[PDB]
Amino acid sequence: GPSVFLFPPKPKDTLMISRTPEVTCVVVDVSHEDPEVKFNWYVDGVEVHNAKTKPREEQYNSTYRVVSVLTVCHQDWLNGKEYKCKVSNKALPAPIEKTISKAKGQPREPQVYTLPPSRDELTKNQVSLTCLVKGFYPSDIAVEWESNGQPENNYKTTPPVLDSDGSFFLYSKLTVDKSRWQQGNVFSCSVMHEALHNHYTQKSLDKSTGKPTLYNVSLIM
Amino acid sequence: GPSVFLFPPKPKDTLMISRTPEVTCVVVDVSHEDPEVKFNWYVDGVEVHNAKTKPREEQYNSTYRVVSVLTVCHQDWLNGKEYKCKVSNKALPAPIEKTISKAKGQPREPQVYTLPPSRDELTKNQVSLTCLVKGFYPSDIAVEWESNGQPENNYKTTPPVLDSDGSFFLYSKLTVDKSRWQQGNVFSCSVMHEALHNHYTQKSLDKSTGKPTLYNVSLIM
Amino acid sequence: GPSVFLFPPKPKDTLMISRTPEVTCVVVDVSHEDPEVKFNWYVDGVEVHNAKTKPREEQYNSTYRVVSVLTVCHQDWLNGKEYKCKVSNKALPAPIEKTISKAKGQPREPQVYTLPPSRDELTKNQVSLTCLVKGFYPSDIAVEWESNGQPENNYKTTPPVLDSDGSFFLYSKLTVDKSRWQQGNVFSCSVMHEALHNHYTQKSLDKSTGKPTLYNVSLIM
Amino acid sequence: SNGQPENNYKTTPPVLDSDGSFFLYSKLTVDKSRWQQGNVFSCSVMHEALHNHYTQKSLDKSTGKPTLYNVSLIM
Amino acid sequence: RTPRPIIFLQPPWTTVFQGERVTLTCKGFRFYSPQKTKWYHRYLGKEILRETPDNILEVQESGEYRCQAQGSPLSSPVHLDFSSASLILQAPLSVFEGDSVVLRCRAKAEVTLNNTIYKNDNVLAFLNKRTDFHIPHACLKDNGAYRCTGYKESCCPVSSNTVKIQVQEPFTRPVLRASSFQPISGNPVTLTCETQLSLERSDVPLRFRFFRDDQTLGLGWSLSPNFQITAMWSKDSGFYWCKAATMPYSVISDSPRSWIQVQI
């Protein structure tokens, strides 16, 4: 008996026009005797021709896997349009349908805050910048890092975590060479979410952020 | 026999994923005897039914202005998809076929330098922030202003101007209440363009951005 | 066909004394005609009858689920004694053995740093502290927040996230009133991990943590 | 520069403002080290409404310096 | 852009026993359908079409349901569950902000002792011989899975099915779309508290309480969303925002503060 796992597009691709998003339905536990599956794709119930299908994949457990990709422009998905992947297999008593859509919930604006490294990591050779992102809904968010208009790849991002308020928060950490931080280098945290205006907010962070040491000289005459 | 004109999608309508680019196909000089017009749209030569048509509007020259509009998925126009606007009219013995795609040419990244106001306008009741956006190509660019994640609507943007090195540059002035600038609020100039990293860049600014917060010398009588 | 699952103790309770570490052998899909399931609890090679089995419970889908909680003590788990439960079901002709133990790997000491709230956050009602925990192994940490010997319950912690180094890292955020933070309270992020010296580290964080100095130097003369 | 005009800049066409007036901009590209020498620069406005039909504003390295050591007096 | 009708389900519990019936009210407020509704009920590889000459479809069969009014797309699917288990968690189909949600869980003709409600697989509240869990003012803090467990007489403790409470906003967050944020002094600018009501609350009258920086413009609340001012001077050029609310003033959302400047 075959199974179908339907995976929604990753939150990164659904928000940047630079990336083409897609929704993929896999069919697992496919025997050797049925190497054909016909994929009918529904966009709000309507047939679509653009569903590119990858070739069959051999599996370690003597089965197969057929994946199918549908390219969708972001205005459809961000409006909550559903999607149906139809599997036409001889081993199936009947075709299976699976519906996926963006989760409906009241949008919440992710207030993005950037915290500079403490005094302690300066002994180490690599400081770790922090981009706290608290209070948003739903948990469809992508955090990317950039400095001087160029991307950073030494970052990791914790999965969203439900808060007491009920709005997910999320943390991102940039491991960077301490020398770059010690000079004047502006590291800006880029965030993407449905609720934000223009689906973007970029918060800057560098060495001179919020040093309130103020020799408040007051000469009196 | 009618004639076919064409307006490409505006930079804003194609840049932010929030909006939706509407390619328009202006048609004028339609004969009174044959006002019914059929419009065909091609996605690399493939018909699409979603395109709608504005009702024909007879002008003061007694010709019917019929206009065809199609919603375009943003990544398609950005990669350079070719859209054929076909005009069908029995007055013309042949269907006129005309072609539009993205204006090709190498893109240059828009450097963004927001500039704080000078000290001598602080006595004036309205401050004037500025966001130089220089060294980009083409002029397919829009500029928006933000403050606490909300758009600002008291901004004006000068048209793109050809520069010495063959690129473009443009400005944007925000008028704010002097007190709002005095309470150290944050205004961020957001500029979106094809050559940028995520087709978006939000160079921010606040009250006394340039001044390093080290020590302020006060001398009192 | 019933299946069984073994759940290791929560990392909170396996490093802590006041709380008790439990290993739960859960079973599912226990149909009513063969509901009696007995447990064979080996700590390493010897059966123990200290294991307490909760009464058989019925799920919504009319399948039984029975848990068997064995209370262990922490020396055995930290030394990685291979616990195993052998569940006897009448469906499978022989009982099923499932073996789990502590994650076998070279321990790496966490390097916990704590980060003050961003100055932008200092306008909101509720500030939020941060306790980054970097470069530890394995991914079993309890993080608690203390103020003056009383624990704080207004905190949430992200799950451990694999880092590029092959270690893990996990943030932890505690929301407190701005009144509490501004007056200068002390918040220490306690983190307990097996590789730590005495399985404990506290990093103190207070209002003046991020201020190097403060010289309100006058000259009243 | 220094009392004699130069031609490397560009100027945006005037744009209608919110209050019905106009505004425009002038971007003068200079060599970065040349600006770092502290040279003085002035932009000139020739408008019909000006008293004397001319106005000069001068700025330079120090004029637009961040000035972290602001010496702000108090009455 | 979404002319999707909706099923209103009475009794409001999406899961019921085998001995009861539920009403499927295919409501299309715009695009009204007095009859001719295609109930595309699919259960297991099915497309059972049961058209009815009215808007109500009282059934007792479990499965996925949706209605098709005239000239409108097919309704948002609703997953029914007609089960004969021992304890069932009854949850409303859709929960909106400020709704008085009562998560009852009732046995199958039995008395259940020591009912304990669970949220996100951990304890939420304890019910001594009580089959009702009450949430006064549902908000975003109330989400995730829910399942109540209670002891039978002597057979077994029983845990109910899991329901997903997903709070949806009654209306989109307002935005103060003023006619002209730069009106020359002495001109009329019409403030618009733009808000698209969620169609499930469409008969709800909305109250738009506009605001200056801190002063309540006008007189309290009003049904109309167009606060047409007459003449704006340099004195009254501050932040402007509007509050939208339902009838009992239980759900109050604040539009973001947009600044209005008076040109002179």
Ligand SMILES: *[C@@H]1O[C@H](CO[C@@H]2O[C@@H](C)[C@@H](O)[C@@H](O)[C@@H]2O)[C@@H](O[C@@H]2O[C@H](CO)[C@@H](O[C@@H]3O[C@H](CO[C@H]4O[C@H](CO)[C@@H](O)[C@H](O)[C@@H]4O[C@@H]4O[C@H](CO)[C@@H](O)[C@H](O)[C@H]4NC(C)=O)[C@@H](O)[C@H](O)[C@@H]3O)[C@H](O)[C@H]2NC(C)=O)[C@H](O)[C@H]1NC(C)=O
């Ligand atoms: C008939 O129903 C039972 C009961 O299932 C419950 O009720 C039904 C109505 C559904 O809503 C279920 O989702 C719900 O659980 C089903 O039994 C389930 O069977 C599946 C598949 O066989 C098991 O999944 C496997 O379980 C583990 C991981 O389980 C952890 O995470 C789950 C999250 O989904 C939790 O439900 C589990 O409790 C467990 O979480 C841990 O629990 C322990 C013990 O309490 C705690 O100490 C830990 O702290 C806690 N950890 C966390 C992070 O929460 C894994 O092997 C694998 O990946 C699968 O997910 C379900 O676990 C099992 N449910 C239960 C409650 O045991 C039957 O499958 C149904 N019958 C049929 C034919 O479908």
Ligand SMILES: *[C@@H]1O[C@H](CO)[C@@H](O)[C@H](O)[C@H]1NC(C)=O
């Ligand atoms: C700095 O000194 C001035 C002049 O004495 C005084 O008015 C002001 O309050 C001082 N500020 C701080 C932060 O100490």
Ligand SMILES: *[C@@H]1O[C@H](CO)[C@@H](O)[C@H](O)[C@H]1NC(C)=O
């Ligand atoms: C003077 O400089 C200090 C330190 O850079 C700064 O905090 C302060 O705001 C400055 N004064 C004014 C009036 O901007």
Ligand SMILES: *[C@@H]1O[C@H](CO)[C@@H](O)[C@H](O)[C@H]1NC(C)=O
């Ligand atoms: C110096 O800085 C303090 C703290 O920001 C400020 O309150 C004070 O007014 C400043 N003094 C002068 C003379 O600008």
Ligand SMILES: *[C@@H]1O[C@H](CO)[C@@H](O)[C@H](O)[C@H]1NC(C)=O
């Ligand atoms: C700093 O010292 C000045 C005297 O020059 C005093 O007026 C001011 O209140 C002091 N500020 C603080 C924060 O102690």
Ligand SMILES: *[C@@H]1O[C@H](CO)[C@@H](O)[C@H](O)[C@H]1NC(C)=O
């Ligand atoms: C009911 O719950 C209470 C409190 O947890 C417990 O002491 C008692 O034994 C339980 N009784 C039954 C019949 O489950």
